[PDB]
Symmetry: C3
Subunit: 307 residues, 3 copies
């Protein structure tokens, strides 16, 4: 038997900022306990007879299938609903007529607002263009904790288009608010820096906790050697676009200067910014990261729906 994280009971999950550090600790432990259980071949039937409907206005097969698999590995059911129109509100009401939990993926933050304005069952926000992707943030935290043993104390590099990558903005805010980080490296090509508004947002936390923040335009052996986590992201189309790829690339040559105890992570999909020539390195955690996503989403759904 598992103990649900009681603060999530019957609650929509809109932003990772709605959780305390204690909530996150509890979700991490529950996800790991389920991982041990499931990987031992034992099953979970607690959500038998409960129905999830995903409503995905943009394709994200990676995130969608994880939510669906999480629901089914708890014994629950999943009903598809093809987006076909009528108002989004009326569509949500249609889902509520037969569902226990909704999973919404829409680029507009307004859509989540509108959905929650009428929904009678919990909505899981599966990601939007405002950078609120609560289960990605939480699975990223779980991955660090499970791979290294702790999140407190780490040096982490956030690597990519930090200007436009609003999901990484949210990840930084969550990490700085909840964990005693040692250092955050912000690695981005010239002109794609983390926005000043985000640094202002975390300033209270960074100064209370004494977290070092360092901006640079590329990786160096010294930065790599200092990091416990290299967190890479995809650069999507500046006149130095192709030329800047070499300074962010993580490959076998780059990992020559890395610690023995560190991980490389990436929310995926990747293009060329993460070479396949480290895919078999024990520190390459970005595939296991997806499996941590399965168990974090099980921990969340179990806690939301257990009664």
């Amino acid at each position: 038997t598992f103990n649900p994280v009681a603060s999530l009971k019957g609650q929509s999950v809109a932003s990772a900022a709605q959780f305390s550090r204690a909530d996150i600790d509890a979700l991490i432990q529950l996800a790991l306990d389920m991982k041990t259980h499931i990987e031992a071949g034992k099953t979970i039937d607690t959500l038998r007879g409960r129905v999830m409907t995903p409503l995905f206005f943009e394709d994200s097969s990676r995130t969608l299938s994880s939510f669906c698999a999480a629901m089914m590995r708890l014994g629950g059911s999943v009903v598809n609903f093809k987006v076909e129109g009528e108002t989004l509100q009326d569509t949500i009401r249609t889902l509520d007529s037969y569902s226990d939990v909704l999973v919404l993926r829409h680029a507009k933050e307004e859509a989540l607002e509108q959905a929650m304005s009428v929904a009678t069952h919990p909505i899981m926000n599966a990601g939007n263009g405002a950078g609120e992707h609560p289960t990605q943030a939480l699975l990223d935290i779980l991955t660090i904790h499970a791979e290294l043993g702790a999140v407190d104390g780490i040096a982490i590099a956030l690597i990519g288009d930090l200007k436009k990558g609003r999901t990484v903005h949210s990840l930084l805010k969550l990490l700085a608010h909840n964990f005693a980080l040692r250092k955050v490296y912000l690695i981005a090509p010239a002109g794609l820096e983390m926005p000043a508004e985000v640094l202002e947002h975390v300033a209270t936390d960074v100064v209370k906790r004494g977290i070092a923040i360092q901006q640079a335009s590329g990786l160096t052996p010294e930065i790599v050697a200092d990091c416990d986590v290299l967190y890479a992201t995809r650069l999507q189309k500046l006149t130095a676009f192709e030329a800047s790829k070499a300074s962010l690339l993580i490959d076998k040559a780059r990992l020559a200067h890395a610690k023995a105890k560190m991980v490389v992570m990436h929310p995926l999909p990747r293009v060329d910014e993460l070479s396949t020539d480290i895919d078999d390195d024990p520190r390459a955690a970005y595939f296991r990261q997806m499996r941590y996503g399965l168990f974090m989403r099980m921990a969340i759904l179990f806690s939301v729906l257990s009664g």
Copy 2:
């Protein structure tokens, strides 16, 4: 435990006209009994190991998801089959190779004929262009009965394009044949009246039962005040199309003259003919109507497949 409606055992459900009043009474009671059970958190596993395949040649996510959710809340399984060609008959045979029940949605009444000409398992007709939508008719009846306590005795207004709305033709025929209605108001813009052939069809029943039939081109305070059910439908594109909307619109101003004990219904989707400014009124039943659809479809599937 639940008692199946025995007359449905192993039978395709092609038209609501195939049921007696006793069948409808029994399906209503079974749907309500399942509603109490399910909403108490209890589950149903009777159809474990049975397979439904929906075959939808036109999109209707509202009707499709209801059938799928109904099947899964009975413990059954659902297999998708994307329409890709080969004959419809060969496709049906393909579904029968592994399914226990088929759900067919096709605009042509010929398609249901062809499917039943070769099918070896029951087919649930999910709606066609001839107006045969048996589970919509039955869920509409359940909604009235559950919301008001009875269908016998009601005055109901059917509002919209009554000329082309063949599904409403079927609803009127079913109501007049099986229930002691007091009165039916037929509210339609000029030129979109209920066809004379439909009034001729119900004439035997209307005269045996003494049902009043009244045609009008718009709602009035007197008609509204007299009705137990306002059943609205969508007007799809006459030179007075936009101008006629005001005479059919149901909004807060219109409900000022309505009874305390009445409901507004709509099979959905709606555009503007049903204002959001009554969506929180207790008499607005068109969202609960969809949940009655879930339990009516469970009652039907349970009765068809229980052995």
Copy 3:
């Protein structure tokens, strides 16, 4: 309870050539034992909590739905994954993060190679353009055995575009390698003969077993009368295309010369090469063939995943 075919445990199923005659015998018996069980109304729950993900880059609703239904009738779960790009390898890794078994349908044999190069769970090959369609071959063998009582000893006609029909190449290789056939008729229009390389491939087996091989450009009463199986396939677009259809057509007139104890088979879909005027003939086995496909795929999945 059922005994799994132990040689399949935890193994990807890439080609029917990976099985011994003993494996095939065992899979046939297991499929038939499951058929009796399931058709008696008894259920199977052995794979409760196990997840299948199909990844279909080409449409084949017939093969896809059979795999999904097989999984669910063993108690297992199915998660869809819409092909959306990222490498196929990264997509496979994504499926492995939450799945127990993958089902791959891709036209390129290279795709199966690439998938197996990184997959950590078994992959079921659902068919490719190299003619490797292991569950079609195995269900075809099961159909013959179940319908006639044995595969050893038969005369079979393979009818269609034998040049380009690479799946039929594989079927011939499998039959000649594993069964004491009496005779294979190769019926194909001029220029569409079975390739010489395939006859060279089976030569060792045909001479050890004494199997007769006979090429002809059309069916005749003498060939029809001699066959235990007429295995027809679809001709897809030579200046004699339409004209050659009459010499391959199987209809009621053609079956006038057939044995009482024989079957007509076809992997499906068909166009006109198999008339509907034999669809009710007891020897028309091509619809039952699909149901044998369900139980063969259950036997396979059960054996792959039982632990």
